Design a protein around this ligand. Structure first.
Ligand SMILES: O=P(O)(O)C(F)(F)c1ccc2ccc(C(F)(F)P(=O)(O)O)cc2c1
Length: 297
């Protein structure tokens, strides 16, 4: 039982050991491009780079580089794009990517400012009367509307390719109370938030991979994607307990490094998956319970 194993790990306080085993077994691929001197200012952190084999390439001719990774989950039938929280000089790239990948949604798991330090840049407009134009990638972005909740805000954005004048509605899901190296404020909050994204249709195969990011795009982003993939996994393979979260994470770390940055987020991943499992295997109310418990209102 998923529950039994979880309690065993907790009872023995093995979360740090398991998490540490994951780091040591994690894949390690080259990041030549990410480390090219010219791209130095395109990476928020020196030690966090997308693997070359899976990095998302901008279709631009100058520099196709952006600190983003395509996490393709074969069995789970779902791809995501994990990227760092855009930098002052990479906002055009970010949206360029969102455009070229035909993304429908963007999941932000961090705040533009955490403890006097900017964990990310204001890459989307805060006021509707002030659209944003990223001149380098010839993109226009406009806040159409937004639904502000207690711990998360969902925004409707219109992304326009100024070149072709083509337009697209991007759904911006912003979890606002997930601290760096911290965890969601309950499995309920998280799942409540994950299912909003799901019901939005942003994760649908009819759209490009959803863009998920935090600060470095590995900790919170990793946690969010791990949870979503495991729940996705234990629904298609009818035999949920066979889903080995630790291994799913390892599968994931093959496409981007450092997914899940703390033993606690790893534990949370298990909690969120176990909790969210109640949905996959019946119970059409736990979702109303998460919404209730998340106190989003
Ligand atoms: O999403 P989180 O909370 O996991 C994060 F973004 F806060 C986080 C994650 C990975 C990091 C790696 C390196 C640095 C660095 F400080 F070492 P560097 O020296 O490479 O800039 C900072 C990092 C911060």
């Amino acid at each position: 039982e998923m529950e039994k194993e979880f309690e065993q790990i907790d009872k023995s306080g093995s979360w740090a050991a398991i998490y540490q085993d994951i780091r040591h077994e994690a894949s390690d691929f080259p990041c030549r491009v990410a480390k090219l001197p010219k791209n130095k200012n395109r990476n928020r952190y020196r030690d966090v780079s997308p693997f070359d084999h899976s990095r998302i390439k901008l279709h631009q001719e100058d520099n196709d580089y952006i600190n983003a990774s395509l996490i393709k989950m074969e069995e789970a039938q779902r791809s995501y794009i994990l990227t760092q929280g855009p930098l002052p000089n990479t906002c055009g790239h970010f949206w360029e990517m969102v455009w070229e990948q035909k993304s429908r949604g963007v999941v932000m798991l961090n705040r533009v400012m955490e403890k006097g330090s900017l964990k990310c840049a204001q890459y989307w407009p805060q006021k509707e009367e002030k659209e944003m134009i990223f001149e380098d990638t010839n993109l226009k972005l406009t806040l159409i509307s937004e639904d502000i909740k207690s711990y998360y805000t969902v925004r409707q954005l219109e992304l326009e390719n100024l070149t072709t004048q083509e337009t697209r509605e991007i759904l911006h899901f912003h979890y606002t109370t997930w601290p760096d190296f911290g965890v969601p404020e309950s499995p309920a909050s998280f799942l409540n938030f994950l299912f909003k994204v799901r019901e939005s249709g942003s994760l649908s195969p009819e759209h490009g991979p959803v863009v998920v990011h935090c600060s470095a795009g590995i900790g919170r982003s990793g946690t969010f994607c791990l949870a979503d993939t495991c729940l996705l996994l234990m629904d298609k393979r009818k035999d949920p307990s066979s889903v080995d979260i630790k291994k799913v994470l390892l599968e994931m770390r093959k496409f981007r490094m450092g997914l899940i940055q703390t033993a606690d987020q790893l534990r949370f991943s298990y909690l969120a998956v176990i909790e969210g499992a109640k949905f996959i295997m019946g119970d059409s109310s736990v979702q109303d319970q998460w919404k209730e418990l998340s106190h989003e209102d």
